[PDB]
Design a protein around this ligand. Sequence first.
Ligand code: CLA
Ligand code: CLA
Ligand code: CLA
Ligand code: CLA
Ligand SMILES: CC1=CCCC(C)(C)[C@H]1/C=C/C(C)=C/C=C/C(C)=C/C=C/C=C(C)/C=C/C=C(C)/C=C/C1=C(C)CCCC1(C)C
Ligand SMILES: CC1=CCCC(C)(C)[C@H]1/C=C/C(C)=C/C=C/C(C)=C/C=C/C=C(C)/C=C/C=C(C)/C=C/C1=C(C)CCCC1(C)C
Ligand SMILES: CC1=CCCC(C)(C)[C@H]1/C=C/C(C)=C/C=C/C(C)=C/C=C/C=C(C)/C=C/C=C(C)/C=C/C1=C(C)CCCC1(C)C
Ligand code: SF4
Ligand code: SF4
Lengths: 30, 80, 162, 138, 33, 151
Amino acid sequence: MISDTQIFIALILALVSLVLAIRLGRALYQ
Amino acid sequence: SHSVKVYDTCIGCTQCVRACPCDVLEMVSWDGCKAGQIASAPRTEDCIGCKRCETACPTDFLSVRVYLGGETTRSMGLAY
Amino acid sequence: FGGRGLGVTVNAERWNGRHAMFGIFAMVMTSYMKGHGLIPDADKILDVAQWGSLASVWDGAGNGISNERAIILIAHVHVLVVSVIAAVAPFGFQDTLVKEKGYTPEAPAGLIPPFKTGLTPEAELINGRLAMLGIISIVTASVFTGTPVVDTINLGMGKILY
Amino acid sequence: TLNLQIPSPTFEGSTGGWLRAAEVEEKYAITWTSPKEQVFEMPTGGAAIMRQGENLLYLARKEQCLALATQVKNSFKITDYKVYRIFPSGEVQYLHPKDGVFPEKVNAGRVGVGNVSHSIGKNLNPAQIKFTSKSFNG
Amino acid sequence: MTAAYLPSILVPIIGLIFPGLVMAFAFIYIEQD
Amino acid sequence: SQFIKPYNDDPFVGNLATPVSTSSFTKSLLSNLPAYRAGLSPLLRGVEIGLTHGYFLVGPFYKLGPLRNSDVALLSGFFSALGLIIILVACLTIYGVVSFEETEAKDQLQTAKGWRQFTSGWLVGSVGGASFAYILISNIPFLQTAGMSML
Ligand code: CLA
Ligand code: CLA
Ligand code: CLA
Ligand code: CLA
Ligand SMILES: CC1=CCCC(C)(C)[C@H]1/C=C/C(C)=C/C=C/C(C)=C/C=C/C=C(C)/C=C/C=C(C)/C=C/C1=C(C)CCCC1(C)C
Ligand SMILES: CC1=CCCC(C)(C)[C@H]1/C=C/C(C)=C/C=C/C(C)=C/C=C/C=C(C)/C=C/C=C(C)/C=C/C1=C(C)CCCC1(C)C
Ligand SMILES: CC1=CCCC(C)(C)[C@H]1/C=C/C(C)=C/C=C/C(C)=C/C=C/C=C(C)/C=C/C=C(C)/C=C/C1=C(C)CCCC1(C)C
Ligand code: SF4
Ligand code: SF4
């Protein structure tokens, strides 16, 4: 099964995707 | 504010000015029709957009035209 | 946002440093009491029939939050209520969380502020940055080894706590 | 000019009158002269009795004032009415009739605003004026 | 469930704190001049 | 003998002077409420209003909440009332942020500094009143059963 560390890695990748999504939203907003 | 245009098919019957509840239109001198007058819209900041002038116009497809645009306090008919 | 002291400002760095010094203190004192057995009924599973559906965690055995975790959370709830009241109704002398639009930003201290020992803002900022860096280091040492955070603190302090 | 000291028609008051935006954004005034004391319907709901002589009334909207003007024109043969706009700063802007002559009658000096020199079927399609600040009229 | 504390931590946060801050900041943004 | 008159001697404003709206009792009660009473700072208006509303906020949560038949009913009700108080304080904060421009005037409610003082007072009063209600229900068995303890 999945461990705690794997879920934490997925959360870190999702936070990176959040930062990239915020940057794309700021770029689209001019 | 709404935009009101008067096209040169106007026959100067003065019905649109009499139908206006907000005093937006008025009759000015002109040479394009037998009546010698054409409608004009100098006061479109008071235009609510009710299109009573368009209902009043007797020329086949209308000579006076109201284009609804940006809404203001006057154009929204707000007493508040 | 940035005009009120929020974001990357010196005020926000100072506030997070203060909260991080308090976090280092709270983790050390939690480790000390948890090693020494000062939490009453630490393995007691809270029952849904008393505390409602918020006590459900859905683990494999007991299906309830432990009493120790609830005590730690309530201890944090106390200082969160203190936090809310201080954020909305600060003391007249106290440093405020949000600043007025026409405020004067504190100058950035650079690599290191001037070495003013005592109850000076420079020493406060130095230990605040130190505490944030220590929290980062403790988290990384905890997640790269599998050692629990209380146990990681006890190992890094040489088994002084327990 | 608007004489602020003109007496008002006798009204018992109503809930239909002007709101805070009249004293904050803009307010409207209508004056008229009656040959006798007579009962008229308020444009905000209710009956008031206008006095013999001059009458000044305050409204929230221009359309309410012009509705009252049309009512007294077709029911009491009163055509001397004047409608003004009043701001909170106290500047009074005369509105109706703008040049003293009613807008349905031609008066010299009036210039045409918004007149188009072709029929409405000669307006442009949007595809000529997309990505361009040219008007659809030409 | 491995890491069973995470639903009980995140569901109240995502369902009450995230929409409250989003509505507050969006309100501040759309009503400011 | 007419009891209903035009408001403020203006017949064309959108209000009427009625016995319910403009009698001596109504004017005295409104002028003696903390929101209108003269000589009060906005902070003390907030303190009184928050004390009253936060004090009465405890009751429905304690008596009708999902934990009402448990031994921790009062604690849960007070905590729920405190959460509602925090939500309303956030509402006050965003209202004051979006409603007022930053002015020197701070002795009126409808100013930025005055509304911030009013919000601070309302929070402190609400916490104090909720805690007082918690103390009173905790320490008086009459309030715990809402009067069935007499039977
Ligand atoms: C590194 C530790 C440290 C230092 C040097 C300071 C220093 C300062 N803080 Mg501070 N603070 C700290 C930790 C620290 N704080 C922590 C951990 C918290 C969170 C609980 C706070 C929360 C806090 C608030 C909310 C406020 C301050 C404020 C202040 C300033 C005014 C003095 C005051 O009222 O003290 C307040 C001090 C505390 C609340 C706790 C600190 C207690 C220290 C660590 C005791 C150390 C004594 C020790 C024996 C050394 C003695 C040296 C000797 C020469 C006397 C001052 C620059 C105020 C400010 O900036 O106003 C403009 C203010 O409003 N602090
Ligand atoms: C769009 C995809 C999606 C959806 C609908 C859900 C739905 C749910 N997740 Mg989940 N999750 C996702 C992706 C998603 N997940 C991913 C990619 C991860 C890995 C990081 C997780 C990790 C995760 C955990 C660890 C937990 C949940 C939980 C939950 C439940 C409660 C909501 C919550 O707390 O969210 C929390 C979710 C996050 C903090 C991660 C953010 C989700 C992704 C990364 C963002 C997707 C946004 C989308 C593309 C854009 C939307 C725009 C607009 C419509 C708002 C709910 C069933 C909780 C649960 O089990 O409750 C029963 C819980 O504890 N999720
Ligand atoms: C997905 C979002 C979400 C979540 C996580 C919850 C969670 C909960 N709801 Mg619920 N609710 C929701 C959406 C949600 N609701 C919606 C959309 C509605 C409208 C139909 C309701 C209507 C509703 C009612 C009518 C009731 C609940 C109740 C409850 C609680 C269950 C009983 C219990 O044991 O608590 C015991 C209660 C507590 C422990 C009090 C919690 C107080 C919190 C922690 C304070 C936090 C305040 C605030 C979030 C701080 C940040 C402010 C910021 C957002 C601006 C539980 C906390 C019941 C309850 O007990 O509430 C009093 C209840 O009566 N809910
Ligand atoms: C209006 C319809 C209605 C009513 C009366 C109730 C009533 C109740 N619900 Mg329910 N509910 C409803 C609709 C309703 N529900 C809907 C539509 C949903 C979503 C589908 C829910 C979902 C829901 C959940 C999930 C839960 C409840 C719960 C509750 C109980 C406690 C709620 C609570 O804490 O209130 C708090 C109330 C207040 C803080 C204030 C009440 C209003 C005051 C009394 C008004 C006073 C006005 C006053 C006279 C003015 C005087 C001014 C001046 C003259 C002095 C209670 C029996 C909880 C429970 O235990 O279930 C039984 C629970 O967990 N409800
Ligand atoms: C819709 C539209 C809006 C505008 C933009 C747009 C692009 C045009 C589009 C948005 C779109 C889509 C793309 C938006 C979807 C977006 C993203 C993916 C949302 C993900 C959020 C993840 C949460 C915050 C974090 C978990 C990490 C936490 C902080 C970690 C803890 C960590 C773990 C425990 C391990 C230890 C270390 C620490 C660090 C402690
Ligand atoms: C609030 C509370 C109320 C009353 C009681 C009280 C005690 C007065 C108070 C508590 C208060 C506060 C004051 C207590 C909080 C206190 C202090 C600030 C604790 C600081 C800890 C920092 C340590 C863990 C780390 C250093 C990081 C190491 C790993 C590494 C650095 C290295 C690594 C490899 C990474 C690269 C950098 C280099 C340098 C090369
Ligand atoms: C009944 C009557 C019949 C029918 C008609 C009617 C008129 C509608 C009706 C009237 C009805 C309604 C309107 C009744 C009116 C009701 C309101 C709800 C009464 C509120 C009282 C609050 C008092 C007890 C407390 C203050 C808290 C004390 C000072 C604090 C101690 C705290 C302070 C901060 C200091 C620290 C310690 C702590 C404990 C934290
Ligand atoms: S739409 Fe109404 S207000 Fe506007 S000009 Fe036509 S009749 Fe007058
Ligand atoms: S109603 Fe039509 S035809 Fe008559 S004057 Fe007005 S625009 Fe011309």
